[PDB]
Amino acid sequence: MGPHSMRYFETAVSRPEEPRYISVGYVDNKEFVRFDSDAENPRYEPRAPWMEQEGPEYWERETQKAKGQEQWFRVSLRNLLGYYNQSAGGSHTLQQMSGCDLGSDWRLLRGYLQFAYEGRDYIALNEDLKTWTAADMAAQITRRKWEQSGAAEHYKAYLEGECVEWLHRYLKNGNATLLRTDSPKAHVTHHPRSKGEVTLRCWALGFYPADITLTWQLNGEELTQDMELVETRPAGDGTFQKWASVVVPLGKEQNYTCRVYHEGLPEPLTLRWEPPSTD
């Protein structure tokens, strides 16, 4: 759904051994490439099978770039120790998210470049792709350095250019697979509680992509705070699961309906609990 996007999520973790560097690329929220410095032969690898349309030169070039990034994160973690007046030791985490959302003219809609240190927002490039916002005092040092050295122009050129150009290539190559959806298979289960009341649980299983909406109604009217939802979770086969439950009075089960919305469904599913047939 929505605009097409590309993202690269990068992490460098220092450990009590040099930092571990991990880079994961996404197209439309689906992992498509991955580099991990802790692998036996560290290289960018296809994570979506349609990426095998690329030749061996693509993987070698991406791998060489990852080697540069690994060094950049290593130097940056070292500068970060100095900013917080620390000597080397323990574990520290530096993360980066970057990428683009594709506009209706196939040009950049929104560009992203954000950093976190120790799980806290550190610095980000603003929407204008020209200015920075620093979150703390150490980040103000990075901000002044990047402003004085013309860093934003380098990132803007990537976001507006290369990022959008390659995203279009990936969308073309992965078209068949990328448009694919797996509709949720839905059902309602009935469970006992403490005094005879009933838990109705609406299950949505085996769906793809992960985005979904589960709702409960009592006589067609939406239920809000009485609804328990679990966070969407991976089934392990590339598909997802979710459930939403309501506590109802016994014998009043038929007055309730669940409705599931998903991009795989031509029409949202409306279902109710019915006692299953038994022997």
Binding site: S91, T93, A235
Partner: peptide
């Protein structure tokens, strides 16, 4: 298959 999905944590170890 039995799954244990661990999320929302920081740091990564």
């Amino acid at each position: 298959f039995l799954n244990c999905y661990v999320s929302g944590f920081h740091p990564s170890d």
